[PDB]
Structures are given as structure tokens and as C-alpha cells.
Amino acid sequence: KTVVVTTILESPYVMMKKNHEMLEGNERYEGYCVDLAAEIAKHCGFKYKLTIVGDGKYGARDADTKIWNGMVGELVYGKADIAIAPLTITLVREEVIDFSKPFMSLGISIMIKKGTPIESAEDLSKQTEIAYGTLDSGSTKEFFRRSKIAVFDKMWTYMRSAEPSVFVRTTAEGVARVRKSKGKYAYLLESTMNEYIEQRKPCDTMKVGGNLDSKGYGIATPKGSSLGNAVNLAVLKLNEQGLLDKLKNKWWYDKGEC
Amino acid sequence: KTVVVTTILESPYVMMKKNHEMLEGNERYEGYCVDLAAEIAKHCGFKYKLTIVGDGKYGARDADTKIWNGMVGELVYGKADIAIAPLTITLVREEVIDFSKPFMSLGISIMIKKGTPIESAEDLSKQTEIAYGTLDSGSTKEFFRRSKIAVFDKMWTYMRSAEPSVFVRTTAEGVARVRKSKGKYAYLLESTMNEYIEQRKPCDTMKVGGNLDSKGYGIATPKGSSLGNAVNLAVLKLNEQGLLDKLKNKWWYDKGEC
Numbered sequence: 125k126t127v128v129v130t131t132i133l134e135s136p137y138v139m140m141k142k143n144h145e146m147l148e149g150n151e152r153y154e155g156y157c158v159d160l161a162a163e164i165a166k167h168c169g170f171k172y173k174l175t176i177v178g179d180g181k182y183g184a185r186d187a188d189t190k191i192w193n194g195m196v197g198e199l200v201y202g203k204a205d206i207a208i209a210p211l212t213i214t215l216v217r218e219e220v221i222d223f224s225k226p227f228m229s230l231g232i233s234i235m236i237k238k239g240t241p242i243e244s245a246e247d248l249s250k251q252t253e254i255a256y257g258t259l260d261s262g263s264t265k266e267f268f269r270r271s272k273i274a275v276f277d278k279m280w281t282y283m284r285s286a287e288p289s290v291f292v293r294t295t296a297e298g299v300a301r302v303r304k305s306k307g308k309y310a311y312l313l314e315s316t317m318n319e320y321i322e323q324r325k326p327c328d329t330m331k332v333g334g335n336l337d338s339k340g341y342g343i344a345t346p347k348g349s350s351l352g353n354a355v356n357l358a359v360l361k362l363n364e365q366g367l368l369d370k371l372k373n374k375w376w377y378d379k380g381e382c
Numbered sequence: 383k384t385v386v387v388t389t390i391l392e393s394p395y396v397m398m399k400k401n402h403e404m405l406e407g408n409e410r411y412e413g414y415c416v417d418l419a420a421e422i423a424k425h426c427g428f429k430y431k432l433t434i435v436g437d438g439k440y441g442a443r444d445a446d447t448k449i450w451n452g453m454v455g456e457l458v459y460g461k462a463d464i465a466i467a468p469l470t471i472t473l474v475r476e477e478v479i480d481f482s483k484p485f486m487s488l489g490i491s492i493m494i495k496k497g498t499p500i501e502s503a504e505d506l507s508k509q510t511e512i513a514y515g516t517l518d519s520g521s522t523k524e525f526f527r528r529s530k531i532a533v534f535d536k537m538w539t540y541m542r543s544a545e546p547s548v549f550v551r552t553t554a555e556g557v558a559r560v561r562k563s564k565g566k567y568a569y570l571l572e573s574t575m576n577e578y579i580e581q582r583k584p585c586d587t588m589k590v591g592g593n594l595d596s597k598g599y600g601i602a603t604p605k606g607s608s609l610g611n612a613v614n615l616a617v618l619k620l621n622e623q624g625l626l627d628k629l630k631n632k633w634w635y636d637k638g639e640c
């Protein structure tokens with residue numbers, strides 16, 4: 125009866141409270157999605173338990189085994205009843221799970237160490253001195269892997285064959301790589317995350333250029349789940365009442381340090 | 383079998399071609415949604431007929447009779463099979479009809495005659511010299527009617543009682559009113575349209591301030607329609623293929639004249 129929620133440890137969506145070792149259950153975490161989960165549950169009328177995705181991934185289907193990993197996998201195989209996280213709504217994913225209307229709009233963007241001579245994706249594609257990559261098992265990698273657009277296809281051709289690997293296991297790893305690369309590495313990640321990091325110490329990174337695409341994050345449930353309808357309506361209601369905008373301001377700027 | 387498509391004459395979504403008089407059927411029209419309709423039809427494998435919504439409205443429910451008008455009404459009462467137009471995804475609408483994932487992201491915005499002493503919604507709410515209104519039977523009017531935000535609530539209190547009426551029957555009427563009111567009227571409309579008009583002659587209007595909210599347009603179908611699933615997946619594929627962005631560029635900036 126208690127709804128198992130799968131989510132991912134990604135700041136500021138879900139983070140461990142400093143004194144979590146002395147706290148229990150859902151009280152161990154804080155963040156945008158923790159606040160959202162509480163609201164969704166209250167509006168749909170269900171008790172829930174937050175769980176961090178086992179493999180720490182968002183979700184991709186293995187080309188060879190055809191098995192889904194990440195949060196998507198936990199829903200597909202019945203390990204979780206719902207996913208409340210910054211999970212990108214994509215075709216390949218909507219084919220196996222359901223998504224509520226988006227609770228946040230975003231797009232792929234470029235993150236650079238301040239001072240880096242890069243202003244756009246075209247710039248990256250036309251040079252070689254500055255390496256660039258994306259998250260592994262994510263929607264961004266898939267975006268480049270399938271793009272028919274000249275600039276993006278060129279970028280994918282480079283990234284897929286670059287050595288050492290330009291891909292990272294977690295968003296945090298990508299951000300750290302940018303910060304330690306002395307301007308020789310640019311990271312491709314979603315806009316709102318890029319924006320968030322730009323407001324965090326050491327305030328040494330920034331978003332450059334416009335977004336490469338437009339899409340959104342949605343609350344996911346297993347195909348045919350009975351929670352689907354109510355969750356979707358809850359998201360729409362919460363968006364219209366301004367809760368989502370308040371939560372972004374709370375976790376992004378109200379706590380900004382730059 | 384031929385799918386009856388309901389849409390609305392709104393530039394640059396659906397417009398009569400310069401030579402429409404010598405054309406028949408779907409050939410009489412051109413625009414973003416005309417192009418989108420053809421793509422959706424091709425991917426879902428259906429033949430269709432474009433029809434212009436009878437009462438020229440988007441869709442609102444009569445508070446007394448509870449009867450829906452506009453494109454929403456044509457779907458609810460079975461007069462149309464699908465709505466392919468810049469129809470805003472809202473809670474009250476999703477309760478009676480189905481919406482595909484967003485094909486365009488936008489937000490409420492402020493349009494002014496160039497030179498008008500207004501920079502934000504707050505500025506409008508604090509003065510009386512400049513009147514401002516919204517479209518009738520639309521999602522924006524509902525936004526202000528339900529807003530509990532100090533500024534927005536204050537604005538609604540004024541608009542609902544303003545004399546003469548600050549509300550308009552069509553988007554065009556609102557734009558024309560701003561242009562001929564010598565800066566004494568400001569119009570609240572959705573960002574994408576505001577931006578479009580700003581790049582059209584006589585280049586005498588401009589969008590000011592940020593969007594008041596964030597939401598999107600979706601393709602709508604009657605509840606339980608057999609087209610729902612395919613249309614939804616089609617929208618996702620088109621966005622990822624870059625088609626939606628291509629269309630935006632084709633009808634917005636490739637035709638700008640300022």
C-alpha cells in the first residue's frame with residue numbers, strides 16, 4: 125500500500141541531510157524532489173517511501189541485453205511504483221513507462237570553466253583543443269547518438285571515439301572534470317542543472333549559448349499503473365498554483381552562493 | 383475514417399494562403415500547425431480534413447450551463463476528432479479531454495506599444511493610466527481568475543471590473559488594440575505570439591518582463607480516443623527529430639520583418 129518512490133541523488137533535487145544518520149526514512153533527505161514528492165503524495169492521497177535508485181542511473185536500454193537500467197528499469201521490472209526525479213521525457217522511455225505532463229522545462233546546454241573560448245555547440249564542433257562529453261546512460265547521450273543535425277552529428281562522431289573517454293558516470297563527475305580541466309573540457313548537461321551549478325561556489329563555471337533542444341522532466345509510473353491519472357492531474361494543479369516555481373526559487377536562487 | 387481536425391485561425395499557426403480563393407480543402411491553409419498536422423497524420427497513418435473552429439474560440443466552460451465552447455467543446459461533444467492548434471494544456475481541460483506531451487513551451491507575457499512606461503506585471507498593477515486585458519474564453523483569463531499571487535490577484539480585480547471592458551474576442555483584437563491605443567493599453571498574451579508579433583511590421587510592439595508562468599501547447603483528442611496514444615508518441619518523435627524546431631524557425635524567424 126505504501127508507494128515505493130525511486131529517485132536519484134542529484135543536487136538540488138535529492139540530497140542527504142547533514143544529520144541523516146540520526147534520522148529515519150524519508151526524513152533523511154531534502155531537496156526539490158523531496159518537497160515535490162511530499163506534495164504529490166498529499167494530493168493523490170498515498171503514503172510513500174523514498175528510495176535511491178540502486179545503480180545510480182537515470183535509465184537506458186542496453187543495446188545487447190535489451191535490459192533497462194536506472195530508474196526506468198526499476199519501474200519496468202516492478203522494483204518501484206513511481207519515479208519522482210529530474211527524469212527526462214523521451215520517446216524510447218514513454219514507450220515502456222508513463223510520464224505525467226512536465227513539471228520542469230529544460231534543454232541540453234554547454235557548461236564551461238569561466239574563460240573558456242567557447243560560445244556555442246558549433247564552436248565545440250569546429251575545434252579539437254577543448255574536449256567535451258556527456259553523462260553515460262542518459263537522454264543527452266541518446267540525443268547525440270541519434271541526431272541528424274550536421275553540428276550535432278559531428279560532435280557525436282568525435283565524442284564516441286575520443287580517448288580517453290569523454291563520458292562520465294554521474295553529473296557530479298562531469299562538473300568536477302570541467303572545474304579541474306583548466307578550460308580543456310566542456311560538459312554537455314541539461315540547462316537547469318547548468319544554471320544551478322553556476323550559482324554554487326567556487327562560482328567558476330557558466331552556461332554558454334542557447335539550449336540545443338527543448339523538453340521536460342516528468343513523473344514516471346509503470347505502464348498502466350493506477351497512480352498515473354491522479355499524479356498527472358496533481359502536477360498540473362501544482363504547476364498552476366505556482367508550487368513548482370516556488371520550489372525552483374527555493375532550491376536554486378534563495379540558496380545561491382554566487 | 384477521415385479525421386476531422388479542429389483548429390483556429392491564428393498567425394502563424396493557421397493562416398489562409400494569399401491565393402486561397404483558387405484552392406480547395408486543406409490546400410487553402412498554411413502555417414506552423416498546418417505543417418504539424420501533415421506530419422502527425424503521416425506518422426499516425428490517417429487522412430484528415432482541416433476545419434476552423436465554429437465559434438472561433440480556444441475553449442472555456444460556461445459557469446452556469448457547464449457547457450464547453452471553442453475547440454475544447456468541439457472535441458467534448460464529438461464535432462471534431464482532434465485539435466491541432468496552439469491549445470494550452472490546463473488542469474480543467476485535461477479533465478475533459480486528452481493532451482499529448484507539449485509540442486511547444488511558453489508562458490503568459492506582456493505586450494506593449496513601444497515606449498510604454500511598463501516593465502513588469504507589477505508595474506501594471508500599480509497604475510491606472512494604462513489599461514490592460516486578456517483574451518476571452520482562454521487559459522490566460524482563467525490564470526488571473528484563479529491566481530492567489532498578490533500582483534496577479536490585484537490585476538484580476540481590476541480587469542474583471544474595468545470599464546470599458548479590457549477583454550477581447552480574439553488575439554488579433556488585442557494586438558490591434560495595443561497598436562491603436564497610443565500606449566494606453568497593454569495586452570496579456572502567450573510569449574510565443576508576443577515574440578512573433580514583435581518581429582512583424584509595423585514593428586511597433588514589444589514583449590516586456592519575463593513570462594508570468596511556464597506551460598505548453600498539446601495536441602488534444604476526445605477522452606478515450608483511439609488516436610491518443612499514436613499522436614502522443616508522434617509528438618515526441620517529431621520533437622526529437624528536430625522537426626518542431628525546424629517549424630518554429632520556418633514560421634517565426636525565417637519570416638521576421640523587423
Ligand SMILES: Cn1nnc(-c2onc(O)c2C[C@H](N)C(=O)O)n1
Nearest residue numbers: 182210211212262263264313314317
Ligand atoms: C538533473 N540533471 N541535470 N543534468 C542531467 C542530465 O544531463 N544529461 C543527461 O543525460 C541528464 C540526465 C537526464 N535528466 C535523463 O533523464 O537521462 N540531469
Ligand SMILES: Cn1nnc(-c2onc(O)c2C[C@H](N)C(=O)O)n1
Nearest residue numbers: 440468469470520521522571572575
Ligand atoms: C496562439 N496564442 N497566442 N496567445 C494566445 C493566448 O493568449 N491568452 C490566451 O488565453 C491564449 C489562448 C490559449 N493558448 C488557450 O489555449 O486558451 N494564444
Ligand SMILES: [Zn+2]
Nearest residue numbers: 140142144145
Ligand atoms: Zn552521509
Ligand SMILES: [Zn+2]
Nearest residue numbers: 163166167367
Ligand atoms: Zn499542496
Ligand SMILES: [Zn+2]
Nearest residue numbers: 421424425625
Ligand atoms: Zn516526419
